[PDB]
Amino acid sequence: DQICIGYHANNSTEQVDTIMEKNVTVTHAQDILEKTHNGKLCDLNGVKPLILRDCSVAGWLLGNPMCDEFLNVPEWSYIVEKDNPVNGLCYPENFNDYEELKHLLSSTNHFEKIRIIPRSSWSNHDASSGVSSACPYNGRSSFFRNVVWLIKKNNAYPTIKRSYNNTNQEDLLILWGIHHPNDAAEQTKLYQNPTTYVSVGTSTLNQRSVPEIATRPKVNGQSGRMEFFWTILKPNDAINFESNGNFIAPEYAYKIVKKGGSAIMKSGLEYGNCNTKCQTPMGAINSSMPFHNIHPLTIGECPKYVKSGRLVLATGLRNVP
Amino acid sequence: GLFGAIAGFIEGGWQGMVDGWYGYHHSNEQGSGYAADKESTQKAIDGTTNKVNSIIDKMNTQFEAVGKEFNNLERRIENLNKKMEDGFLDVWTYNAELLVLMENERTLDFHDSNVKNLYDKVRLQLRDNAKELGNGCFEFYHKCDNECMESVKNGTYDYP
Ligand SMILES: *[C@@H]1O[C@H](CO)[C@@H](O[C@@H]2O[C@H](CO)[C@@H](O)[C@H](O)[C@H]2NC(C)=O)[C@H](O)[C@H]1NC(C)=O
Ligand SMILES: *[C@@H]1O[C@H](CO)[C@@H](O[C@@H]2O[C@H](CO)[C@@H](O)[C@H](O)[C@H]2NC(C)=O)[C@H](O)[C@H]1NC(C)=O
Ligand SMILES: CC(=O)N[C@H]1[C@H]([C@H](O)[C@H](O)CO)O[C@@](O)(C(=O)O)C[C@@H]1O
Numbered sequence: 001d002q003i004c005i006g007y008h009a010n011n012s013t014e015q016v017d018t019i020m021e022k023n024v025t026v027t028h029a030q031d032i033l034e035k036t037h038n039g040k041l042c043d044l045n046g047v048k049p050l051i052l053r054d055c056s057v058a059g060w061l062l063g064n065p066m067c068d069e070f071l072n073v074p075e076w077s078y079i080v081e082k083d084n085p086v087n088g089l090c091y092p093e094n095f096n097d098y099e100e101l102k103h104l105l106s107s108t109n110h111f112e113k114i115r116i117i118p119r120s121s122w123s124n125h126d127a128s129s130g131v132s133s134a135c136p137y138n139g140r141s142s143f144f145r146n147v148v149w150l151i152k153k154n155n156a157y158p159t160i161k162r163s164y165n166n167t168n169q170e171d172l173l174i175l176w177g178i179h180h181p182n183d184a185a186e187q188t189k190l191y192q193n194p195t196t197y198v199s200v201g202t203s204t205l206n207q208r209s210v211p212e213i214a215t216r217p218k219v220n221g222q223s224g225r226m227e228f229f230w231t232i233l234k235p236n237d238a239i240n241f242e243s244n245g246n247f248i249a250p251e252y253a254y255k256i257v258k259k260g261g262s263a264i265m266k267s268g269l270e271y272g273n274c275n276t277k278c279q280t281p282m283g284a285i286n287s288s289m290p291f292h293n294i295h296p297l298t299i300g301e302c303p304k305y306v307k308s309g310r311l312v313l314a315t316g317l318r319n320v321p
Numbered sequence: 322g323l324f325g326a327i328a329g330f331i332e333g334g335w336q337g338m339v340d341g342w343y344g345y346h347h348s349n350e351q352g353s354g355y356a357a358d359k360e361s362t363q364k365a366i367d368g369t370t371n372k373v374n375s376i377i378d379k380m381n382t383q384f385e386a387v388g389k390e391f392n393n394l395e396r397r398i399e400n401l402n403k404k405m406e407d408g409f410l411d412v413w414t415y416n417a418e419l420l421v422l423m424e425n426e427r428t429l430d431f432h433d434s435n436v437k438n439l440y441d442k443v444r445l446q447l448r449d450n451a452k453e454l455g456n457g458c459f460e461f462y463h464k465c466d467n468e469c470m471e472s473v474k475n476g477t478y479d480y481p
């Protein structure tokens with residue numbers, strides 16, 4: 001007659017690692033590493049993202065004619081831009097503090113567009129000839145839609161003096177620019193006055209830009225260049241513009257809604273008509289696992305990211321036949 | 322194992338005991354059979370469950386990468402940014418992997434210790450009334466039946 005003490009055993013094939021020994025087969029284990037995603041870009045808790053497709057953030061904000069899809073985008077959860085969107089600055093040039101503006105976007109969920117300076121408000125200047133073959137639309141020369149490339153009228157460019165007061169509750173993102181002609185002859189043909197500038201002033205901003213008339217290689221058929229600026233006009237503050245030429249004046253600006261909590265995700269995927277609580281640039285994640293090794297740049301309620309290929313915890317004991 | 326029981330003085334496991342992690346296998350007149358020890362088994366289950374939860378909860382403040390862009394003349398800060406984010410990802414990946422490795426080892430020794438202590442508890446019970454075969458089994462001198470067997474597991478076993 002006997003009584004023996006013993007331990008469980010099964011047909012488990014699960015394996016775990018330890019410092020002194022690898023691949024120890026155990027009776028029970030627990031995988032804690034999520035390794036799959038759905039390969040799509042979904043809505044984040046019901047809110048759809050802003051998929052810029054072939055337009056860059058600048059193409060969208062300035063109003064590149066090829067970006068009409070985003071003239072009035074609604075509230076978004078996160079933003080997706082491609083690595084190299086073809087539609088950005090149709091007329092060649094530079095966008096000042098572009099990366100800082102993009103970073104600012106990353107902390108907002110909505111840009112409501114409003115008209116701060118009617119295009120019909122320019123009575124002593126040509127506000128219709130400001131176009132270029134570099135920004136085509138419906139087979140003809142056009143231009144960024146949110147700003148105005150002002151031209152001289154009746155062989156004159158009387159000095160401009162415009163002021164705008166932010167009577168809204170939200171911070172206002174204002175964009176404007178200046179044109180750098182290719183030579184003196186061009187300066188005279190477009191603005192008449194040879195020596196010009198664009199001065200802008202708010203309670204905090206002080207600036208005066210001058211055109212740098214030079215000749216350069218052709219980009220999108222143009223050897224001229226546009227230089228764009230931006231500032232945030234606080235509620236109740238006013239912005240003053242003065243210029244005797246080369247001014248690319250604002251028309252539309254954006255009211256900023258800091259519902260705060262966004263991100264500019266780099267991806268070539270399009271919208272996958274799905275909903276998730278955790279999104280990576282490669283696809284969504286839906287799991288209870290504490291960890292995941294999909295991608296490090298995620299948004300929403302997600303598992304912790306690690307580079308591990310395998311992460312299994314032992315729960316049961318060593319499985320001995 | 323560290324406590325020498327599992328795959329030790331008790332050479333193998335019992336495929337026939339599906340009632341738990343540790344238990345007994347008796348043999349008398351009436352018959353034989355396996356019976357998992359619910360006390361120690363459950364005590365182990367609670368311990369492992371708390372361990373898994375602790376591990377997870379301790380990995381709730383890990384670093385989180387944030388997307389930023391830099392222009393052509395900001396290569397130094399872009400690299401500083403990249404080295405920093407990779408830096409923390411490598412640290413937490415190390416933390417996750419090492420913690421699992423170390424605890425997995427402790428989990429195996431934990432089970433080993435439980436078996437060893439269950440065995441020793443029984444050994445103390447069957448003071449001089451049983452013979453230690455040294456294989457995890459005890460052979461009684463004078464016959465012992467199902468009521469007697471249940472007595473040991475009952476933890477009530479005692480001449481008193
Ligand atoms: C923008 O317009 C607002 C509204 O007219 C100006 O603020 C008001 O200014 C008057 C006159 O000084 C004050 O009596 C009111 O108390 C102000 N109201 C508010 C909303 O504060 C404001 O000065 C203008 N902004 C600038 C910088 O010119
Ligand atoms: C469980 O422990 C009890 C003592 O607490 C052991 O004693 C017997 O218990 C049963 C009830 O399960 C009684 O009917 C018997 O009369 C008790 N022994 C005698 C003959 O006095 C019991 O053996 C242990 N295991 C079981 C359930 O048999
Ligand atoms: C505002 C204006 O005059 N637009 C004209 C421009 C400008 O002269 C240059 O862009 C200045 O750099 O030149 C064009 O060849 C072009 O761009 O398509 C014709 C166009 O009508």
Ligand SMILES: *[C@@H]1O[C@H](CO)[C@@H](O)[C@H](O)[C@H]1NC(C)=O
Nearest residue numbers: 009010011012013014336339
């Ligand atoms: C035995 O192992 C096989 C393969 O993993 C499994 O499908 C089967 O359910 C196991 N037997 C039991 C305990 O049912």
Ligand SMILES: *[C@@H]1O[C@H](CO)[C@@H](O)[C@H](O)[C@H]1NC(C)=O
Nearest residue numbers: 015016017021022023024025
């Ligand atoms: C561990 O086991 C796996 C089984 O898939 C095998 O691929 C791996 O090479 C093993 N590692 C060791 C310690 O050899």
Ligand SMILES: *[C@@H]1O[C@H](CO)[C@@H](O)[C@H](O)[C@H]1NC(C)=O
Nearest residue numbers: 275276277278284285286287
């Ligand atoms: C995740 O999967 C579970 C199980 O099917 C489901 O109940 C839940 O709705 C899913 N979550 C999402 C947003 O995919």
